[PDB]
């Protein structure tokens, strides 16, 4: 029970598909391009996460600030509750003070 | 990334291998065998 009885379908990786072969190209776009662009401008993703990092409370606060006016009501309500929950957790509970 | 244990079967047999000559349910049921194998060692 719990362990598969046949080998899984073999996994073939093309180590030289175009995505892998060109990975990292232009990561020095600033230092090699007269700093017209910053490498963070190459990051694609949510508008609230490009070239920025934080813990989960900071991300939720940042997402609420920037796209919160555009969120669906159920999702915005969950985000409000999540911020409140993390607010209590990070400010009032834990081993260290 | 959801990681689940995949070789638990082999972890279990490492105890059960020493319990096979015991009597009763403590020769096959890990919960019981693990305690009697520790005592045996």
């Amino acid at each position: 029970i719990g362990i598969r009885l046949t080998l899984p379908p073999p996994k073939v990786v093309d180590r030289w598909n175009e995505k892998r072969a060109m990975f990292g190209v232009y990561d020095n776009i600033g230092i090699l391009g007269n700093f017209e662009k910053h490498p963070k401008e190459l990051i694609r993703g949510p508008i609230w996460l490009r070239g920025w990092k934080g813990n989960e409370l900071q991300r939720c606060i940042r997402k609420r600030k920037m796209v919160g006016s555009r969120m669906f009501a159920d999702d915005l309500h969950n985000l409000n509750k999540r911020i409140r929950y993390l607010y209590k957790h990070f400010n009032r509970h834990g081993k260290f003070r | 990334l959801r990681n689940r244990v995949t070789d638990r079967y082999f972890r279990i047999q490492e105890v059960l291998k020493h319990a096979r000559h015991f009597r009763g349910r403590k020769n096959r049921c890990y919960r019981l065998a693990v305690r009697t194998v520790i005592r045996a060692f």
Binding site: I3, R4, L5, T6, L7, P8, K11 | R4, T6, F10
Partner: peptide, 26 residues
Amino acid sequence: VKKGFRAAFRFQKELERQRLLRCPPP
């Protein structure tokens, strides 16, 4: 179904050892 290969391979080796003990070859 769990991800991975190693335990499945390792379990295959154990099923193969049992078959030999079950049916030892000439």
